Write a protein that binds this DNA or RNA. Structure first.
Lengths: 58, 145, 215, 165, 37
RNA sequence: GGGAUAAGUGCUGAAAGCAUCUAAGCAUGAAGCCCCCCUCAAGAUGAGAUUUCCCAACUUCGGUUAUAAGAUCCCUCAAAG
RNA sequence: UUGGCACCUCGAUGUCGGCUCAUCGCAUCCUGGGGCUGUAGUCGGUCCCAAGGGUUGGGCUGUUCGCCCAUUAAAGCGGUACGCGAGCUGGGUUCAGAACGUCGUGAGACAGUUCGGUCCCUAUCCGUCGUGGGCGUAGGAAAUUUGAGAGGAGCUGUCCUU
RNA sequence: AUAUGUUAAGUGGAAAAGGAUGUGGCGUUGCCCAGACAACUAG
């Protein structure tokens, strides 16, 4: 379930779950999939910043 | 059971969309519409409730295929009677009643459950380019190839 | 084209040219009046409603289909006519040669016209498999226990069930039959009756519809 | 598909009016409305005919080789006139029964009322249509192997057999 | 019109072509016409 | 009878300057054919269908009222069973 | 088809032919299109396409088999527990009686021949053929649109006009 | 998804002797604007 939600929320910033996950790991973030989804659902602004960090790590 | 948001009634917001089948592959188009109907592009997606939106195909009679699929790809159907097997080529099913050709195609990519049947009743296909749903104010939706 | 409703009286015989016997069927058809005119811009198909028998008008406490008012009355008040007993439709006649309130007479038909009669059958109620369908019975002697009964209804293991339409016993009768390629011996305007060469389906005092054969 | 790829493509002295999707050549008795292919474009700068060969592929190798000769006869029929000479024998023989409790649909056994029975010459502008009609009237009586009785061109072979299916 | 799996030119007057994805021997003689299939 | 069709017969025509039913195209052609035509039952929770006509006081239409060739219950019957 | 193997059934999967009723195939008997013939006309050798319907009464051998008589446009080959016995018969195979022939010292045996010999069941579930009650559509009475379904389809012989 | 190729049969998503003007690769030669190779006339 979590993976599905993340994929949908990560597809609103022209990105794919596989690409986002990869970037996050290279960035050094250790957030859980259950936590990542929870954030996206509520504070969407905070999620936007996270994506930026993952996009900077390519 | 820690904490996981679950969508339900008086919390789900369904919108309306208008997809154009002008020069689009049957299978390639149906696949995209299916996901939208189930609502797998929503962040608050839930499997035990319906969170999908309504889709409306405008053209549908200008749908094209690849190779000799208009001559082959027959559609069989039984009538539960000894020797009651009827068939019809896809090409001949596009000339007359082309709306059923798209309906079945998009209805074959949905789960065969109680929710699956209710989710398949939110699809409206036509043959011209004028739909009688101007009161819902549906907006255009570009296909994310 | 040329449609009309009548009642089946009986069956007689009439001698034609060159002393040739001809069995005919007396069909009484009177009080035929158009009640409506279905168009293609209001219904999507051209047709005309026609009545047949008459009945008494306004009546209060009346627990019988013979005389009252309200529903049927109003619809029959639209045109200049009285309440009708039977009502039918014809989508084979022209809807430009009729007018709401016209009187369809029996002068539309002429001797030597091919017509198609239509009506319900008599009815024999619950019948067996030897009467409903033309089936044969088993030996009446030679130590046999198989008489007027059906045989096998399927095969064996493979497809262990009965296919739809196994022709078993049941009610047989009330069915809509339509005889084609008939003939109008002679038409009478004095008693408003039509002589059809042959026999139409249905019992005595039954409703029958006549239409010009397409073929 | 064994034909000289290179085509002469001679110029057309007759008037030509290309409309892009459809090309019509009007002249002494031309005016033959016909829609050609839209894949390879043409280069009709003036009276001299010319066609471009875009893409350069197996399909374009034949498509470009067809249009070139597809318009050659088109303008050729607008100035000239394709005519074929048909020779045959005029008799009228056709089946057998003699005469021209119930007969097979009223009367039976009817041949043909000889009206022409001479060398016919079809006069047209479109070779395609000309050929069709020419063969259409040549199918009336296929050249029999007996004595070549029936509409034909010239080919004929002597024979007299029909006992085994 | 013979229909056998193997089709080879009998003489040099017979030519082989391909019509509707089928090997045929369009020959001049009418008794030398064969079709694979 | 109508529409495509099978085997097949063709007409033009091209990636060997010829040829060639073919790769475009134009025809013709079966009890073929399930298609259409003919006969019968049929509103389809893809709540669907359609047309014509008839029907109002209670009392915030809560139904306290209720009306409609509106339904029965009961009774004389048969073209029905 | 005759066989090879022995994986399901021995606290039972009980039966060869005929009768009644059926469905499906095509490797086509009849009807329909064609092609080529060492294919005179009739007519037919073979081959290709084609499954929609239709495919008979008797005598006899014990009959599935076969042989004959007379017809027919034709008397096609198969699959479904070698279709169908909680639908029928019991002729065949067949159990206790009894003869004949061969075999055995004998009780008896024989894929020899002959006469006689009890075939059980009130339909719960699915399935099929008919026929109603209850609700639902946001409806009281009529009259209907209908391509979803079923049925039916191409056999003969003369007459008479180049 | 990225990068490059192969296939036109729905091959993919059932077999063999054999047959074949399908197509892409590799090689090894024989002619080529003195003009091969279509086109064509001398016995």
């Amino acid at each position: 379930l979590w993976i599905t939600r993340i994929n949908a929320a990560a597809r609103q910033h022209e990105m794919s779950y596989s690409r986002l996950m990869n970037g996050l790991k290279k960035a050094g973030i250790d957030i859980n999939r259950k936590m990542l989804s929870e954030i996206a659902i509520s504070d969407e602004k905070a999620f936007a910043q996270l994506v930026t960090k993952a996009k900077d790590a390519l | 059971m820690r904490q996981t948001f679950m969508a339900n009634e008086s919390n789900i917001e369904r919108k309306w969309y208008v997809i154009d089948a002008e020069g689009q592959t049957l299978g390639r188009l149906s696949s995209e519409v299916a996901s939208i109907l189930r609502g797998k592009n929503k962040v608050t997606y839930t499997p035990h409730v319906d969170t999908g939106d309504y889709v409306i195909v405008i053209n549908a009679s200008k749908i094209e295929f690849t190779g000799n699929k208009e001559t082959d790809k027959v559609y069989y159907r039984h009538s539960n009677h000894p020797g009651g097997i009827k068939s019809i080529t896809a090409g001949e099913l596009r000339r007359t009643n082309p709306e059923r050709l798209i309906e079945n195609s998009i209805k074959g990519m949905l789960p065969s459950t109680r929710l699956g049947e209710k989710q398949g009743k939110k699809l409206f296909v036509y043959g011209g380019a004028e739909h009688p749903h101007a009161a819902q104010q549906p907006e255009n939706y570009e296909l994310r190839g | 084209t040329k449609g009309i409703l009548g009642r089946k009286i009986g069956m007689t015989q009439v001698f034609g040219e060159n002393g040739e016997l001809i069995p005919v069927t007396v069909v009484e058809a009177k009080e035929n009046v158009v009640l409506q005119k279905k168009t293609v811009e209001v219904d999507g198909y051209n047709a005309i409603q026609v009545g047949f028998e008459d009945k008494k008008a306004y009546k209060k406490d009346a627990k019988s289909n013979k005389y009252a008012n309200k529903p049927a009355e109003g619809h029959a008040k639209k045109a200049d006519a009285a309440p009708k007993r039977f009502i039918r439709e014809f989508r084979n006649v022209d809807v430009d040669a009729y007018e709401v309130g016209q009187e369809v007479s029996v002068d539309t038909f002429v001797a030597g016209d091919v017509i198609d009669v239509t009506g319900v059958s008599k009815g024999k109620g619950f019948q067996g498999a030897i009467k409903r369908h033309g089936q044969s019975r088993g030996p009446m002697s030679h130590g046999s226990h198989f008489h007027r009964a059906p045989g096998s209804v399927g095969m064996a293991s493979d497809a262990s069930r009965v296919f739809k339409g196994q022709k078993m016993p049941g009610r047989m009768g009330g069915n809509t039959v339509t005889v084609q390629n008939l003939e109008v011996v002679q038409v009478d305007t004095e008693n408003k009756v039509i002589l059809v060469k042959g026999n139409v389906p249905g019992p005595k005092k039954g409703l029958v519809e006549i239409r010009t054969s397409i073929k | 598909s064994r034909v000289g790829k290179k085509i002469i493509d001679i110029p057309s002295d007759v008037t030509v009016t290309f409309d892009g999707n459809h090309v019509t050549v009007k002249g002494p008795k031309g005016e033959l409305s016909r829609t050609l292919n839209e894949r390879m474009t043409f280069k009709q700068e003036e009276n001299t005919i010319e066609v471009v060969r875009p893409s350069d592929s197996k399909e374009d190798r034949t498509n470009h080789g067809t249009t070139r000769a597809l318009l050659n006869n088109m303008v050729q029929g607008v100035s000239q006139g394709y005519v074929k000479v048909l020779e045959l024998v005029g008799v009228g023989y056709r089946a057998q029964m003699q005469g021209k409790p119930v007969e097979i649909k009223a009367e039976e056994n009817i041949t043909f009322s000889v009206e022409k029975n001479t060398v016919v010459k079809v006069e047209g502008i479109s070779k395609e249509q000309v050929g069709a009609l020419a063969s259409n009237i040549r199918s009336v009586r296929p050249p029999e192997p007996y004595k070549g009785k029936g509409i034909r061109y010239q080919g004929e072979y002597v024979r007299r057999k029909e006992g085994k299916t | 019109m013979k229909v056998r799996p193997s089709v080879k030119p009998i003489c040099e007057k017979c030519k082989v072509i391909k019509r509707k994805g089928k090997v045929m021997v369009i020959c001049e003689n009418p008794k030398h016409k064969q079709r694979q299939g």
